[PDB]
């Protein structure tokens, strides 16, 4: 269905010629590169780099159209299909590459970053959708889940949703101390802003993390026991003592980071 994709490019090509931004020969050259890429994308041996090589191409075309808009038309935005045609295409390139190659966490990353950058053009709901699928394909990668929890606590400052992410993550991957480490950091990120807000409130007029800390050891200890043990329980008593020791030493060292984490927080007791 190579022609189907090329045909959707015809209306904007006509708009470019109609507005005078690009001449017919110049517009013809653009289509030639688009046609060559589309065959590369739809063929066998297509790799994620082909999406990346294409995705950069219309990005450059987008810049030139913007410059020629000011250079010829002397208009910031000409009300026609050309303005949003490329950006709609860019998202339309990304979703195929992500669907074709859900493995490449790198390609997911540009897709979110490209889209977060154009916040006005792309609603936050769609960014939530992409994270939903991205989280949904890779539940075991902590780096993803703190990423979506992050986007909603700075751009949106929704602690309820951000709580639900770190909340839901510890269920899927309770073994990773890092996600425990960040959730406690988020929990004390939250309390200080309220207390600082309370201090500001007075001027113009916590234990919850410890429970997360307490429950952190119980899960991590259990998981550290499951490993270094394999399928089967360890018959020898001395090893069973030893396996306790590594869990202990593991469960001391994790606690020692949390002692360091509190130090940065001056307001809290």
């Amino acid at each position: 269905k190579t022609r189907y994709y090329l045909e959707q490019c015809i209306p904007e090509m006509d708009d470019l010629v109609e507005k005078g931004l690009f001449t017919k020969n110049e517009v013809s050259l653009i289509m030639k590169k688009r046609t060559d890429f589309e065959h590369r994308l739809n063929s066998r041996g297509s790799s994620i780099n082909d999406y990346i090589k294409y995705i950069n191409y219309e990005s450059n075309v987008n810049k030139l159209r913007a410059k020629r808009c000011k250079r010829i038309l002397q208009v910031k935005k000409t009300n026609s299909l050309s303005d949003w045609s490329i950006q709609q295409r860019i998202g339309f390139i990304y979703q195929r590459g992500t669907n074709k190659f859900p493995q490449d966490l790198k390609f997911w990353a540009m897709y979110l970053n490209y889209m977060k950058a154009r916040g006005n053009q792309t609603s936050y709901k769609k960014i939530h959708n992409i994270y939903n699928q991205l989280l949904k394909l890779h539940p075991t990668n902590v780096d993803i889940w703190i990423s979506c929890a992050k986007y909603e606590y700075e751009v949106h400052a929704n602690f309820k949703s951000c709580r639900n992410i770190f909340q839901n993550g510890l269920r899927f991957n309770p073994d990773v101390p890092k996600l425990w480490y960040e959730y406690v950091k988020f929990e004390l990120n939250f309390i200080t802003k309220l207390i600082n807000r309370r201090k500001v409130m007075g001027l113009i007029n916590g234990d919850i993390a410890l429970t997360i800390f307490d429950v952190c050891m119980k899960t991590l200890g259990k998981h550290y026991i499951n490993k270094h043990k394999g399928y089967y329980a360890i018959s020898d008593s001395k090893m069973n003592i030893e396996l306790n020791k590594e869990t202990l030493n593991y469960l001391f060292s994790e606690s020692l980071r949390y002692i360091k984490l509190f130090d940065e927080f001056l307001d809290l007791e």
């Binding site: 269905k1 190579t2 022609r3 030639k32 060559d36 065959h39 590369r40 063929s43 066998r44 041996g45």
Partner: protein, 454 residues
């Protein structure tokens, strides 16, 4: 001086990759593509032949069938793979047609099974229910275990029996509510949670042979009488509404699922009549390609197509706006068709005959049930419209219209045509002299009278 010459970039036309698809240049200038009309005709004429060699309607039969002739078929309007079938032996069967086996087999009545309908009784997922009526003067509600869902894990067998003073000859269920109607010596409205008939409907003393509830305006009911009459009822008033007395008896009815006010009737004059509820003085359409009495008729859930079963050992399936059958299904082993019904996905036809076999037929003989590629669907989609464009071409008509019809039906038709010509010459001869003849519309000859004039 200024010169440019046509220049090919070898990389563009021949990809550097062995795996990359070669660029597929197209130019839509009509001069590049001569003989526009001839090529489409040849593709049309080629498509029509291919349709014939691929016309493969029979798929299989349901298990081992019934012991005595099959005389009642009911589809589960909520599940695809499920039928309720009955035979005059007194046995009723509930089928898993996807596996072409029986869920369960039950000896319901001492006498003949004269009606069968599947319901969802609302007693005041894992089990399905069906209602059977017979000439032994009882109606029995049954329960069958089904394997649609595994959310549980029994009580399979008779649940309730309704005794009647007279024999029952038809049964159907109201779609929304548990109430069901039985057609005996009197048309009776029944409730599941009441053993006696809740309401007595009857225009007069004449019996009722068949009945069918509405699907869209479900409060309306139609029934057929042995006095060559069709009776309409409405439950919101709990009274009959209309009758028209017909020349011949009507054996079965089906109401159009897409038009609430439209219905078709299977008639005894080798015809099936399409009716409009509000003005029944005439018919909407007439279907006249059978040579024996039409026993059953069913509307497709698409609402655009109708299938008729007749006593002449054939199943004809007609377009709603066209008065002649587009297809015939027949077999040596099929003895008499009494029930024709549609798979409610509209892709298959379930038929029952007195040989005891319940058969699956394809609505589209040439179509195939596999999932097709995006390319594949386009070409099949191409042939249909191209055939649609060139339907009346002389060669395409000959190949498309040609069917292998059994010797007995063709002989009946050619005899049938002779009398009609023999009749037609006769009034034409009379028309030369007798002054006052009203031309009788073909849509109005078969009505005898209507009680309520309009």
């Amino acid at each position: 001086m200024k010169i440019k010459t046509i220049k090919r970039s070898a990389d563009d036309y021949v990809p550097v990759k062995s795996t990359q698809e070669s660029q597929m240049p197209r130019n839509l200038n009509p001069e590049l593509h001569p003989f526009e009309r001839a090529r489409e005709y040849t593709k049309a004429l080629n498509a029509t032949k291919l349709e014939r060699m691929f016309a493969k309607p029979f798929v299989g039969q349901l298990g081992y069938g019934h012991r005595d002739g099959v005389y009642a078929i009911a589809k589960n309007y909520g599940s695809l793979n499920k039928l309720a079938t009955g035979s005059a032996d007194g046995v009723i069967k509930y089928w898993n047609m996807s596996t072409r086996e029986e869920f369960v087999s039950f000896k319901a009545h001492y006498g003949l099974v004269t009606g069968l309908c599947v319901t969802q009784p609302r007693f005041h997922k894992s089990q399905n229910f069906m209602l059977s009526c017979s000439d032994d003067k009882t109606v029995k509600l049954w329960s069958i275990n089904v394997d649609d869902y595994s959310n549980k894990n029994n009580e399979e067998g008779l649940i309730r029996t309704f005794d009647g003073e007279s024999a029952f000859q038809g049964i159907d269920s109201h779609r929304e509510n548990s109430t069901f109607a039985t057609g005996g010596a009197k048309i009776h409205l029944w409730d599941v949670n009441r053993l006696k008939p809740v309401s007595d409907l009857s225009w007069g003393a004449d019996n009722i042979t068949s009945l069918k509830f509405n699907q869209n305006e479900t409060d309306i009911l139609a029934s057929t009488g042995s006095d060559n009459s069709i009776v309409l009822y409405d439950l919101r008033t709990n009274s009959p509404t209309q009758k028209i007395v017909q020349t011949m008896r009507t054996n079965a009815i089906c109401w159009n699922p897409m038009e609430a006010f439209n219905f078709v009737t299977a008639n005894e004059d080798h015809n099936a009549y399409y009716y409009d509820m509000r003005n029944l003085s005439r018919s909407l359409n007439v279907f006249k390609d059978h040579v024996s009495a039409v026993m059953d008729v069913d509307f497709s859930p698409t609402g655009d197509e109708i299938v008729t079963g007749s006593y002449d050992k054939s199943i004809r399936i007609y377009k709603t706006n066209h008065g002649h059958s587009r297809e015939i299904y027949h077999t040596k082993r099929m003895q008499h068709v009494f029930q024709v019904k549609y798979s409610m996905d509209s892709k298959y036809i379930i038929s029952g005959s007195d040989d005891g076999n319940v058969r699956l037929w394809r609505s589209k003989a040439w179509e195939r049930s596999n999932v097709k590629t995006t390319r594949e669907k386009n070409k099949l989609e191409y042939d249909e419209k191209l055939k649609e464009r060139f339907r009346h071409m002389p060669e395409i008509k000959r190949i498309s219209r040609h069917r292998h019809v059994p010797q007995v039906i063709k002989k009946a038709q050619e005899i049938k045509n002779i009398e009609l010509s023999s009749i037609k010459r006769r009034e034409a001869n009379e028309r030369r002299t007798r002054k006052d003849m009203p031309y009788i519309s073909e849509r109005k000859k078969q009505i005898v009278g209507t009680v309520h004039k309009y």
